[PDB]
Amino acid sequence: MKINRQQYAESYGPTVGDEVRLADTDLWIEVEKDYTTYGDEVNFGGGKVLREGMGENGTYTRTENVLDLLLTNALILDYTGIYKADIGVKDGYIVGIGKGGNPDIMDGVTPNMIVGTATEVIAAEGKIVTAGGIDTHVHFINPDQVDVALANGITTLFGGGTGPAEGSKATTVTPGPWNIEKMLKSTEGLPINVGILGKGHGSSIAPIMEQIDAGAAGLKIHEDWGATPASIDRSLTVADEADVQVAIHSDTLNEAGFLEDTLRAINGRVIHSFHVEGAGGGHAPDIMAMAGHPNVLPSSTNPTRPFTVNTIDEHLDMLMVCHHLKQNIPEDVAFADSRIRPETIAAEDILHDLGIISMMSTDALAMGRAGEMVLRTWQTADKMKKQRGPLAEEKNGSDNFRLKRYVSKYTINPAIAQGIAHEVGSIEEGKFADLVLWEPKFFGVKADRVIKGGIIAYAQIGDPSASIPTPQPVMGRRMYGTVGDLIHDTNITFMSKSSIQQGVPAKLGLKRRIGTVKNCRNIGKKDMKWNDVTTDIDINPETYEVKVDGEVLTCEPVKELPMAQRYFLF
Amino acid sequence: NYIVPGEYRVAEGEIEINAGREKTTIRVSNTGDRPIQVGSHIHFVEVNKELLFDRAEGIGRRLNIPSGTAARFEPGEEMEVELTELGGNREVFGISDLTNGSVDNKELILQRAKELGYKGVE
Amino acid sequence: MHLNPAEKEKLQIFLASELLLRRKARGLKLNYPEAVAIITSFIMEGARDGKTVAMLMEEGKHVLTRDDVMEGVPEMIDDIQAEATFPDGTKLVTVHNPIS
Ligand code: NI
Ligand code: NI
């Protein structure tokens, strides 16, 4: 007996060779392989397969290869591939990617993916499943920012801040032992994974280091605190001892040095370069030249992504209003004009497409949108396909190569850069079960269900008083993973090795899972999945033209984007 | 070219289910006065007692229908269905408690079925 | 007023439908959330008028047409479901393929 492909895909989600459009973009992803056994697909419901004696095993105890949760029929989009599989979760972690069910009567069942009495089922047929987004440029300014991030599929926030204090409104910094301890305590009630950055500023080691020992997971060097050679140097020395990452927003003003001076202070050490294009901050006008170096892990923030006809106007004014600039004072305007450049923003689209900028991030509430990292990543990929055509490396009509290059920017690469990719950042066996389900029509726009540590934390769901959950109004809502003590077991506080060894979690009464920051001083640009290109980026000091391999990198701004007015109420 | 957000573009061809497994066609009759609907993956010899068919032919088999679908028998309806072979370890536990072990034990399964009145044992 | 949880949530559907109707009245092609809001509020107000579930299931397919909405919106909306207090208590209305 045979099933035609259209019918197959409607029932079980797509299978090998089938393609799916991402939202209302022009981008197509193709199923590369499928772990199922045709005819023994898992599914749940009345008269369906996962029933006792059938696709559900009625013999094994939980410990005997039985799952806590099976996501059936997922279309996985990840750096590791675009393929169809069942996903098995146990103790909060992804334990199996393969074929789930009952070995009694089914062929091809992954041995530790038994559906038993202990197993919960999530039907992923017809959905795209990705890792939770890793946002490594977060300002902790307003607690309402967390649902905003969860609704666009972000599950980890790395950054700093104490709320709406001017230090935190400008810089991703939680300064000093006491602020760090207070924000670790605050973090106990935020339904998302968190890592806190201390102030990467000082001329003595101790003041910096004590922040790491208190529980910070890394450091931020920002020009508003003095992004000087000394502060860069001391932070990187602390980082190299502590095994944590340093992010940098360099000296825009070129006050103590030009880009080459900042690079000489860095001295070959590993560093994460935030908003590398430089509209978000950085040596004017040539900070984006950092993205060509081997020891730099480069990210963009999102308001420049991608280059649109309103981008410059909105930035020029944004910059003026947050710096209290005046169009009357000539220096103020020369400053704005040196910082907000059409030439570098256009080239940032193309550096993303080439794999030269490895990561995306938000800059949430400081100069970036908390719920648009995922959104703008895909809008950028879509714009580049239209302007540059499919990358040479593509297949059929698939955009699979570009899709793995771009999903990597907000999942695995940020995790790698921050020393937390043993726990999060990709759909792989042995990693925390932070998983986002998307309807294809809403892909990258609004997440269906966000799973945190193997329990749903956030969902687009309807009237709580109705007979069923689908009646209006359907809106993003916190789920049971966020309630009571469950918020501790489904989320991770990422901390330095020294704060963990010193018993900070116990000193402060932290109940959240504690994740260890590690392995981030011996990585480089070569470790950025699908985005590992090192090259000589030239930024002309007079015209701000960007050249890579002797060619000018230019593209036009677009008037319209997908994943925009078809979806949003405002 | 009209954009349907999230639409599929499926490849050409058909998907063959339960490929390379032996198929068997049998006649089954619902001798009861209420409707019986049977799922794809229930061990076929352990279905409702009132379904009359050669019970030996259900052993170690299930319906050869798309995973998660079911065959329906109205009161008094007789029709042919096609079965396919169970896979994996070819063991069945629970359900109607007729097998509880290997499906190779046909005489034991048929003895339990006959004693409990599952219609159609020789 | 003694508002319960659902009454207040559902007020927001009415509001979103007022917003969308204004947008439609100044000539715009409606988007996904706007179309859903207009059809949902139509159903709720029809239940408040005393229509039957079967009447609203028919009428709901004629509130907005494809030329009222953006490209692809018809195909994004497979159904619209809403629960409202009819004269005989709360009932569920499901409008299948409301826009074609
Ligand atoms: Ni910055
Ligand atoms: Ni920032």
Curated annotation (Swiss-Prot), chain A:
UniProt-recorded name of the protein: Urease subunit alpha
UniProt binding sites for Ni(2+) 1: 137, 139, 220, 363
Keywords linked to the UniProt accession: Cytoplasm, Hydrolase, Metal-binding, Nickel
HAMAP family (alphabetical): Urease_alpha
Pathway(s) of this molecule: Nitrogen metabolism; urea degradation; CO(2) and NH(3) from urea (urease route): step 1/1
GO molecular function terms attached to this record: nickel cation binding; urease activity
Record keyword Membrane present: no
UniProt source species: Sporosarcina pasteurii
Protein family according to the UniProt entry: Belongs to the metallo-dependent hydrolases superfamily. Urease alpha subunit family.
Activity regulation summary: Inhibited by fluoride.
Cited Pfam families: Amidohydro_1, Urease_alpha
Catalytic residues in the record: 323
Highest rank taxon of the organism: Bacteria
Quaternary structure annotation from Swiss-Prot or TrEMBL: Heterotrimer of UreA (gamma), UreB (beta) and UreC (alpha) subunits. Three heterotrimers associate to form the active enzyme.
Single GO biological process annotation from the record: urea catabolic process
Residues where N6-carboxylysine is found: 220
Domain Urease: 132-570
Binding site for substrate: 139, 170, 222, 249, 366
Family annotation (SUPFAM superfamilies): Composite domain of metallo-dependent hydrolases, Metallo-dependent hydrolases
Gene: ureC
Keyword Cytoplasm included in the entry's annotation: yes
Localization per Swiss-Prot or TrEMBL: Cytoplasm
GO cellular component, one term: cytoplasm
Cofactors required: Ni cation
Note on cofactor: Binds 2 nickel ions per subunit.
Curated annotation (Swiss-Prot), chain B:
InterPro entries in alphabetical order: Urease_beta-like (IPR002019), Urease_betasu_sf (IPR036461), Urease_subunit (IPR050069)
Coiled-coil residue windows: none
Gene Ontology molecular functions: urease activity
Keyword Cytoplasm: yes
Keyword Hydrolase: yes
The protein's Enzyme Commission number: 3.5.1.5
GO biological process: urea catabolic process
Gene3D superfamilies: Urease, beta subunit
Keywords: Cytoplasm, Hydrolase
GO cellular component, one term: urease complex
Subunit structure comment from the entry: Heterotrimer of UreA (gamma), UreB (beta) and UreC (alpha) subunits. Three heterotrimers associate to form the active enzyme.
Protein name: Urease subunit beta
Organism: Sporosarcina pasteurii (Bacillus pasteurii)
Gene, per the UniProt record: ureB
Swiss-Prot record, chain C:
Catalytic activity: urea + 2 H2O + H(+) = hydrogencarbonate + 2 NH4(+)
Keywords in alphabetical order: Cytoplasm, Formylation, Hydrolase
GO cellular component, one term: cytoplasm
Annotated InterPro entries: Urease_gamma, Urease_gamma/gamma-beta_su, Urease_gamma_sf, Urease_subunit
Modification note: Although not discussed in the published references, Met-1 is represented in the submitted PDB entries as being modified by either a formyl, a carboxyl, or an acetyl group. The N-terminal is probably N-(dihydroxymethyl)methionine, the hydrated form of N-formylmethionine.
CDD domains per record: Urease_gamma (cd00390)
UniProt-listed Pfam families: Urease_gamma (PF00547)
Pathway where this protein functions: Nitrogen metabolism; urea degradation; CO(2) and NH(3) from urea (urease route): step 1/1
A GO biological-process term: urea catabolic process
E.C. designation(s): 3.5.1.5
Superkingdom of the source species: Bacteria
Cellular localization per UniProt: Cytoplasm
UniProt xrefs under Gene3D superfamilies: Urease, gamma-like subunit
A Gene Ontology molecular function term of the record: nickel cation binding
Major subcellular site: cytoplasm
Subunit: Heterotrimer of UreA (gamma), UreB (beta) and UreC (alpha) subunits. Three heterotrimers associate to form the active enzyme.
HAMAP family documented for this protein: Urease_gamma
Family as reported in the entry's similarity comment: Belongs to the urease gamma subunit family.
Protein name: Urease subunit gamma
Gene of this entry: ureA
